[PDB]
């Protein structure tokens, strides 16, 4: 896995150069916003099982077929599998919120997710809309808790739904 620091370290290592002015400025930029990420992560660790359920109910209010007959969140086995999947998305979104880099999401979530979902019949679309219902919930909850900047909260879910995304453009 990579955080932002090991990203800069691997970036400078492949050319064999030391840190310049700009590398120290980007490391200061990660270390200055570190406390903000950590109180956001602790506030998410407060209400994880609540946020996952609320994002799930907002997703099922969005796409109503999945609770109904032909949908994929049909039975309670499928309902519990979908809510555990949303718990996975919030967990690795917290991990990428603390790390500040998208390599944990790429190595442990997004690599080969589409294969499993296309095979099992799990749809990829309401998965993404549920991921960003989680993102919107986290964003307004942490903007309510005195935190000025929300770009780092914006980062990992936007990456996760740029990757599961179907490129049609």
């Amino acid at each position: 896995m990579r955080d932002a620091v090991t990203s800069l370290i691997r970036n400078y290592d492949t050319t064999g150069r030391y840190f310049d002015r700009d590398a120290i400025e980007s490391l200061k930029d990660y270390f200055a916003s570190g406390n903000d990420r950590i109180t956001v992560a602790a506030m998410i660790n407060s209400q994880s099982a609540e946020i996952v359920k609320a994002a799930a109910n907002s997703l099922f209010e969005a796409v109503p077929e999945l609770l109904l007959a032909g949908g994929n969140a049909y039975t309670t086995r499928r309902f519990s599998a979908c809510l555990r999947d949303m718990d996975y998305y919030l967990r690795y979104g917290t991990y990428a919120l603390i790390a500040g880099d998208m390599d944990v999401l790429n190595e442990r979530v997004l690599q080969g997710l589409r294969e499993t979902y296309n095979s099992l019949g799990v749809p990829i679309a309401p998965t993404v809309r549920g991921i960003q219902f989680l993102k919107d919930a986290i964003k307004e909850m942490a903007a309510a808790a005195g935190i000025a900047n929300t770009a780092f909260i914006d980062e990992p879910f936007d990456h996760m739904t740029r990757e599961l995304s179907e490129v049609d453009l």
């Binding site: 039975t75 309670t76 086995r77 309902f79 519990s80 555990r84 996975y88 442990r108």
Partner: protein, 141 residues
């Protein structure tokens, strides 16, 4: 063929079983401050219990009931009253034994599957199996 006979009898008269459940339920009798959003969900679930009872009766194993209504309780415990659902399923069992008769053999099959339903509505939840890993590079699920 007897399992099909009782399944066809249950299917042909499911509407009056659900209606008998409806004026049994709506352990206080329910206030009907629920509104349409809870009410359509309630009517769908009082159907759905009978559906997987019928599927279990034809299939021959109550596992189709078990793997669904085991963890069902805490999904709907924030929603509604759980003993109301319990007396609802008990009443639907009584409505099946109302509907057909046998020489105490098909009634016994029906009370077996309905008893699996009332047993699994009290198993409230088992915690999920944790694949914790010892390796660092591995991920736990």
């Amino acid at each position: 063929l007897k399992r099909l006979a009782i399944a066809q009898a249950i299917k042909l008269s499911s509407q009056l079983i659900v209606s008998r459940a409806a004026n049994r339920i709506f352990r206080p009798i329910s206030v009907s401050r629920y509104g349409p959003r809870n009410m359509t969900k309630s009517l769908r679930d009082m159907a759905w219990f009978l559906r997987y009872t019928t599927y279990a009766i034809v299939a021959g194993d109550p596992s189709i009931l078990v793997v669904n209504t085991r963890g069902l309780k805490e999904v709907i415990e924030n929603a509604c009253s759980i003993p109301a659902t319990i007396v609802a399923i008990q009443e639907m069992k009584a409505a099946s034994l109302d509907l057909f008769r046998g020489d105490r053999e098909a009634q016994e099959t029906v009370v077996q599957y309905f008893d699996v339903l009332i047993t699994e509505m009290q198993t409230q939840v088992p915690n999920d199996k944790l694949r914790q890993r010892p390796s660092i590079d591995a991920q736990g699920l």
